[PDB]
Design a protein around this ligand. Structure first.
Ligand SMILES: Nc1cc(C(F)(F)F)c(-c2cc(N3CCOCC3)nc(N3CCOCC3)n2)cn1
Length: 811
């Protein structure tokens, strides 16, 4: 009965009944389910016995940055507290020893190593040999002025949390084109063999329920088929009218060559090799193609031992590795010199390998099996659809194992999208993502939401559903925590639907008061309170502050939900925006890229005071956006009295930062303005105006609502006069302040160029997302031109300077 309860809770959580998996009677699904369940159960068993500091590393991973301070410290299970004057260079152990001395003297009774410091009212902890200023929390307090509030949590109390959370044939390749086609009856199939993007041979071609009975033969023998060969079909009508497409692997998940009848449930729309290799689930309405794979003999793909035995036998390039037909022959000829003296040029060699020649593949695989590990940057390139081979993919994952949990988190969105390129359910990328999620609860949280947010997409629902199920087997406690989040989102959807309907029939004050009555119902107060934020599991959403909740006036009536927490103090006051009706994927991608820019800038000692707030799609055109409190749009501020509208922004800054605080607010504005000008320029984010640019009371400028990127609508560099007016401290002429700002823009731009390959590799992997503004090479080209990677640093700077000077004349 406890197993029945778990199964039904997984079905509710993942948004797909587990019985739907059994009904498909698919051995590949059944084998994934059984093998991944045991793999995830072993991880849960390993975690149950972790030491209390190891459990802390799993559950509350440290949040680190890429003088003196007062710290308030209390003990768990006590209202009494003490404020200490410690240095920002002190370790958390020095703070814990200082706190324990104050408790021993106050209790009249005479071990810091048995403790960890919790950030009050947050699932965040300060531990390890790190100075206080290297923790994101202390560093954040230092900037905002605020005093850190910490709680001494004992080892026995952390161990109580761990315990509570327990559970060949030279015959040429051929097929037989042997249902519900909807096309013009006045009019009257194209097939192709692919190994990723590359064609293995020339395309071979053929008014409802059509009968062909045609022999389709390819110019390639059955022995030359690579292990990852794809047969791609396109049903169209004779300008061209496309109807449907369908792909399939020639070998199944058990390495055996497919040799029987097949019905292909087609996806509606010429050839689409990147598209999924699984049939359309809507078998009732989709067009189908009847196909027959002839019995060529069983025949399995040769095992690694047989391949290494064949590839074992065998026998100017520096200028090529920075390609023409002759240049590809000299890369292949010196393939051993490429392995021994240019291991990082592996991808270039893989691209010139004749994948339609089995002899050439075996020799490539022979070198690959002894190739040294490559840096993470090189491994991310190998994950592209251009490299579909199973051994190349396994080598890429092996090179990605050295990723830190922080780097893994930074690239997680791309690694999830790469699952859509996978040919089989059980793959080394799924195993890697699952193992890494089960060893870090933050990774497990965002992996869950990335998969859950796409369950309404038929091409990925089975795959993503199966991975979330396996994850749930590895953490019964976390499943319950994520269920509490899903229950809140379910209520926000019902509440937002009421708001949409009510706003079309009555005034704003009236709809807002009815929203509050709906929220004040017991089922709503319960579902909306006491949860971990889906935007950030370390932020606790305690009591929903109904009186402060409202909705915004745009088409979808987004909800603005406020929360508070007595235990967290002023830092427990957090807000979330719930939006339903628009897709948040591109905003999430933009914001993660800005966050990556902020990390790269900070690694070079450049802090541009950015605000990369949370954005998380959770379902079908549904998601959450983190509220940055104490901020307002440029337009709202431009609505003390300004004699000239040009002084409004500066006057607003002055009212929030009087006396000596003004100078530091102007500086925060200048730094963040340089960062956002550079980010929007490099990413090609146009349509920036007073309604989608905001300013914080600290002076920090930030952008919101990134509806367009990569020049979709070349987006020129933008210098806005009202922003230049603040940078110049309200003066007409101030080249000393203006030119410092130009230095910030140029420094930020030159740093991004040094990591240009990282942005290109991440954006190439994101082509799997199916985002309409990141759908071809022209979109990637935009980033190559904005970062000017072909030019030297001096030419790129000169060209950036021409663009910046053009923006200043336009200002
Ligand atoms: N795709 C979207 C949609 C909205 C969406 F919320 F509008 F849907 C927002 C949005 C709008 C908004 N508005 C407030 C100002 O007026 C315009 C709307 N304020 C914010 N904030 C998040 C960061 O902290 C500050 C608040 N996000 C962003 N991206």
């Amino acid at each position: 009965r406890v197993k029945k309860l778990i199964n039904s809770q997984i079905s509710l959580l993942i948004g797909k009944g587990l019985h739907e998996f059994d009904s498909l009677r698919d051995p590949e699904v059944n084998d994934f389910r059984t093998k991944m369940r045991q793999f995830c159960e072993e991880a849960a068993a390993h975690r149950q016995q972790l030491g209390w500091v190891e459990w802390l590393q799993y559950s509350f991973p440290l949040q680190l940055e890429p003088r003196a301070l007062l710290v308030n410290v209390k003990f768990e299970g006590s209202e009494e507290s003490f404020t200490f004057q410690v240095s920002t260079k002190d370790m958390p152990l020095a703070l814990m020893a200082c706190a324990l001395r104050k408790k021993a003297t106050v209790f009249r009774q005479p071990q810091p190593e048995e403790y960890a410091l919790q950030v009050n009212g947050r699932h965040e902890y300060l531990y390890g040999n790190y100075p206080l200023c290297h923790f994101q929390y202390i560093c954040s307090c230092l900037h905002s002025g605020l005093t850190p509030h910490l709680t001494m949590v004992h080892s026995s109390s952390i161990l109580a949390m761990r315990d509570e959370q327990s559970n060949s044939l030279e015959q040429p390749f051929s097929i037989e084109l042997i249902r519900k086609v909807n096309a013009d009856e006045r009019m009257k199939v194209q097939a192709g063999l692919f190994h990723g993007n590359e064609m293995l041979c020339k395309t071979v071609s053929s008014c409802s329920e059509p009968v062909w009975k045609q022999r389709l033969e390819f110019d390639i023998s059955v022995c030359d088929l690579p292990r990852m060969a794809r047969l791609c079909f396109a049903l169209y009508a004779v300008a061209d009218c496309p109807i449907a497409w369908a792909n399939l692997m020639l070998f199944d998940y058990k390495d055996q060559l497919k040799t029987g009848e097949r019905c292909l449930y087609m996806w509606p729309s010429l050839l689409n090799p990147a598209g999924t290799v699984r049939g359309n689930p809507n078998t009732e309405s989709a067009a189908a193609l009847v196909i027959y794979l002839p019995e060529v003999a069983p025949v399995y793909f040769p095992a690694l031992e047989k391949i290494l035995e064949l590839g074992r036998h065998g026998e100017l390039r520096e200028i090529l590795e920075r390609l023409y037909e002759h240049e590809k022959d000299l890369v292949w000829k010196m393939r051993h010199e490429v392995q021994e003296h240019f291991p990082e040029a592996l991808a270039r060699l893989l691209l010139v390998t004749k994948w339609n020649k089995h002899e050439d593949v075996a020799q490539m695989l022979y070198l690959l099996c002894s190739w040294p590990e490559l840096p993470v940057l090189s491994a991310l390139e190998l994950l592209d659809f251009s490299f579909p081979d199973c051994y190349v993919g396994s080598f890429a994952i092996k090179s990605l194992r050295k990723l830190t949990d922080d780097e893994l988190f930074q690239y997680l969105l791309q690694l999830v999208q790469v699952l859509k390129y996978e040919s089989y359910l059980d793959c080394e990328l799924t195993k890697f993502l699952l193992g890494r999620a089960l060893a870090n609860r933050k990774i497990g949280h965002f992996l869950f939401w990335h998969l859950r947010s796409e369950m309404h997409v038929p091409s990925v629902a089975l795959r993503f559903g199966l991975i979330m199920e396996a994850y749930c087997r590895g953490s019964t406690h976390h499943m319950k925590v994520l269920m509490k989040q899903g229950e809140a989102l379910s209520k926000l959807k019902a509440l937002n639907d009421f708001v949409k309907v009510s706003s079309q029939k009555t005034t704003k004050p009236q709809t807002k008061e009815m929203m509050h009555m709906c929220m004040r119902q017991e089922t709503y107060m319960e579902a909306l309170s006491h949860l971990q934020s889906p935007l950030d599991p370390s932020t606790l959403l305690e009591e929903v502050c109904v009186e402060q909740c409202t909705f915004m006036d745009s088409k979808m009536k987004p909800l603005w939900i406020m929360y508070s927490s007595e235990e967290a103090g002023s830092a427990g006051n957090v807000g979330i925006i719930f939006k339903n009706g628009d897709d948040l994927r591109q905003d999430m991608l933009t914001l993660q890229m800005i966050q990556l820019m902020d990390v790269l800038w900070k690694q070079e000692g450049l802090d541009l005071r950015m605000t990369p707030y949370g954005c998380l799609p959770t379902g079908d055109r549904t998601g959450l956006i983190e509220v940055v409190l104490h901020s307002d749009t440029i337009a709202n501020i431009q609505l003390a009295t300004a004699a000239f509208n040009k002084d409004a922004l500066l006057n607003w800054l002055k009212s929030k930062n009087p006396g000596e605080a003004l100078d530091r607010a102007i500086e925060e504005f200048t730094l963040s303005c340089a960062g956002y000008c550079v980010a929007t320029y490099v990413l090609g984010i146009g349509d920036r105006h007073s309604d989608n640019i905001m300013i914080r009371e600290s002076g920090q400028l930030f952008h919101i609502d990134f509806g367009h990127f990569l020049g979709n609508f070349r987006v020129p560099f933008i210098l806005t006069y009202d922003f230049v007016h603040v940078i110049q401290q309200g003066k007409t002429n101030n080249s000393e302040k203006f030119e410092r700002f130009r230095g910030y823009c140029e420094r930020a731009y030159t740093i991004l160029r040094r990591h240009g390959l990282l942005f290109l590799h991440l954006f190439a992997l994101m082509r799997a997302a199916g985002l309409p503004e990141l759908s071809c090479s022209k979109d990637i080209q935009y980033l190559k031109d904005s970062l000017a990677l072909g030019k030297t640093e001096e030419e790129a700077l000169k060209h950036f300077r021409v663009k910046f000077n053009e923006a200043l004349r336009e200002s």
